[PDB]
Design a protein around this ligand. Structure first.
Ligand SMILES: *[C@@H]1O[C@H](CO)[C@@H](O)[C@H](O)[C@H]1NC(C)=O
Ligand SMILES: *[C@@H]1O[C@H](CO)[C@@H](O)[C@H](O)[C@H]1NC(C)=O
Ligand SMILES: *[C@@H]1O[C@H](CO)[C@@H](O)[C@H](O)[C@H]1NC(C)=O
Ligand SMILES: *[C@@H]1O[C@H](CO)[C@@H](O)[C@H](O)[C@H]1NC(C)=O
Ligand SMILES: *[C@@H]1O[C@H](CO)[C@@H](O)[C@H](O)[C@H]1NC(C)=O
Ligand SMILES: *[C@@H]1O[C@H](CO)[C@@H](O)[C@H](O)[C@H]1NC(C)=O
Lengths: 254, 254
């Protein structure tokens, strides 16, 4: 059941399996959202969490580890990701899709974890309607925009209040898996880094499906955006664990 | 047990689990190699294969699907990958490491799969000793090179016979996971595309661990290397299923 937070313990011998079932009616897209965290401060035994779809498998390790420049390590405890939104057409049918969440680890004593699942109520961006959302290095986001019939070009405008952390806004076509990671978001489509403002101009003629994904991914450090670095004698920067950035996104017709 | 090919059937209700255990003595690196293939020609239900380590989880889908330019799809049946090589130091101990291989799917009838596991006998490249190996878009490779005490710079030279397919040779530091995919290999470290020849100059001063990984990844198409494209009316190019490239690698002291 969505909108519920399960709590559990993991260890070498026991793994937890939760099967979710849901339907997506035609002309409406429903993106699933997974909200995991683990309280294990240790890094030699991170808890692995996998989400399996009908076609795609996505796995990650918690607490997520980042290796910035100058060999500083970062340990993030809250991780989150959005799955491939299965698309339905005028070929109707209540597609009774299923999604597995499997958690396991090999910690000698174990590790705590809390897991929440929820469909994104606002997944399809609307024209000229400003939306507010909070991102984070380990909590990337993305939403689907569908072009209108009359409009032939759009400008997507993103505004933030606090300049740091550095962030990246990308636009890709609809062919999942969706590239929403710091080391991979740059491979495909358009993208740009930003602190306060960003704007991408898109034409429907370059997108055969007349609908595209917009992905927001926050960097772990701020070197690429000209930021500074707090020199700390501790390699594991436990202070950099709650990085967040408020964001407003609006798509205006060109 | 390594050097053995297991055969099995997968479906919605049944999954297969095989736990492997092995040890890596200090000053010797042992990289595990996973050799999977599936005979399911269908693409709406690919079989998912995951490999779980003590810290890292790596998952892929078979038959692997590639989306080149001009919306041509490719279906590769043989997939393979090398895991994170756990490193042991003068702090001795026969590290009795374990690695899980879990296979599952939801095909309405099922899908065949054959799985083989083996340690790489030649994983640490030797100076001035030429090595021969066969790569492929879905079968990437990588090996570890360790700098000598006297030598301070090296040149790695790669030579192939057949110009196509296009390939990429990358060098990264030792901090796994190792970036050995077409959309990600370009993120970190040095790399270059090639058809027949390539050469990377490296200094030990830029590598704190005085040892680096060398990754060979073959592209699915040849557009980036100036190759042509066989125009076919079939979107699923079943002919492009056995792409291979013989390769010779030699590290000379600068
Ligand atoms: C979802 O699908 C599974 C198997 O496909 C089934 O066992 C389960 O009952 C379904 N959920 C609902 C609410 O019917
Ligand atoms: C973990 O996340 C859940 C919801 O995602 C939240 O209720 C809980 O407080 C979080 N735990 C910690 C320790 O932050
Ligand atoms: C068929 O497609 C059109 C345009 O995409 C849409 O307006 C209409 O609602 C669809 N029909 C049904 C029954 O959903
Ligand atoms: C490998 O480790 C597992 C559990 O850690 C153990 O059950 C198994 O016996 C080990 N393998 C060997 C050959 O001892
Ligand atoms: C699958 O791979 C195994 C070894 O990796 C090999 O023996 C077998 O012939 C392969 N099957 C097919 C259909 O290629
Ligand atoms: C200790 O390290 C040195 C250099 O790395 C190596 O030659 C030696 O064999 C190591 N000692 C043991 C007991 O492995």
């Amino acid at each position: 059941d969505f909108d519920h937070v399960y709590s559990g313990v993991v260890n070498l011998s026991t793994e937890n399996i939760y099967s979710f079932n849901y339907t997506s009616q035609p002309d409406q897209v429903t993106a699933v959202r997974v909200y995991v965290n683990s309280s294990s401060e240790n890094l030699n035994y991170p808890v692995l969490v996998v989400v399996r779809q009908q076609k795609e498998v996505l796995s990650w390790q918690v607490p997520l580890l980042f290796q910035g420049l100058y060999q500083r390590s970062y340990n993030y405890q809250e991780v989150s990701r959005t799955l491939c939104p299965s698309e339905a057409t005028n070929e109707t049918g209540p597609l009774q899709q299923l999604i597995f969440v499997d958690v396991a680890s090999m910690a000698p004593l174990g590790a705590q974890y809390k897991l929440l699942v929820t469909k994104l109520k606002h997944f399809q961006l609307r024209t000229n309607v400003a939306f507010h959302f909070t991102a984070s290095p380990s909590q990337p986001q993305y939403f689907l925009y569908k072009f209108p019939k009359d409009v032939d070009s759009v400008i997507i405008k993103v505004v933030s209040e606090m300049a740091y952390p550095c962030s990246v806004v990308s636009v890709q076509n609809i062919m999942c898996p969706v590239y929403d990671l710091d080391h991979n978001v740059e491979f495909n489509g358009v993208y740009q880094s930003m602190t306060k403002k960003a704007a991408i101009t898109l034409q429907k003629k370059d997108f055969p499906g007349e609908q595209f994904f917009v992905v927001f991914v926050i960097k772990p450090e701020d070197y690429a955006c000209g930021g500074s670095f707090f020199i700390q004698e501790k390699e594991n920067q436990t202070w950099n664990l709650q990085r967040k950035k408020n964001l407003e996104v609006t798509i205006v017709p060109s």
